């Protein structure tokens, strides 16, 4: 059982279709975004960032969650298309001002108590 109400899809195949369509739109947009907002990154870097953002949510196994993320990504895409964001909003995806947080146990042990 465990019957739940659909948002957009009936199974995971349609969710995958929507994800692919969204990735198509984002890949198409990256060059115009880089040129129009006068970013200092390369189109290769922007497309790699889009790939990384899409890969962050690769483990999702629920069509409702998946197409909700698709709706959110479409909202973000519409923000970027209509130039509602600024350079600062776009540049944040890259965390260029944040010090690299180390991962090994010894480095963490030295800096502080945060695991």
């Amino acid at each position: 059982g465990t019957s739940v109400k659909p948002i957009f899809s009936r199974d995971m195949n349609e969710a995958k279709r929507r994800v692919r369509e969204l990735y198509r739109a984002w890949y198409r947009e990256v060059p115009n975004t880089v040129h129009l907002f006068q970013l200092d990154i390369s189109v290769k870097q922007g497309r790699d960032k889009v790939r990384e953002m899409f890969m962050k949510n690769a483990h999702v196994t629920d069509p409702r969650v998946v197409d909700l993320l698709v709706i959110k990504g479409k909202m973000e895409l519409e923000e970027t298309i209509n130039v509602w964001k600024q350079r600062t909003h776009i540049m944040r995806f890259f965390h260029e001002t944040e010090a690299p947080r180390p991962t090994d146990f010894l480095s963490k042990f030295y800096v502080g108590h945060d695991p």
């Binding site: 909700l68 909202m75 973000e76 519409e78 923000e79 964001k85 600024q86 909003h89 944040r92």
Partner: peptide, 17 residues
């Protein structure tokens, strides 16, 4: 909360992104 068949659903108060 998602609303179906909304003419234009997006953020209205929070910062972009």
């Amino acid at each position: 909360v998602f609303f179906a068949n909304h003419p234009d659903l997006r953020r209205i108060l929070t910062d972009y992104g």
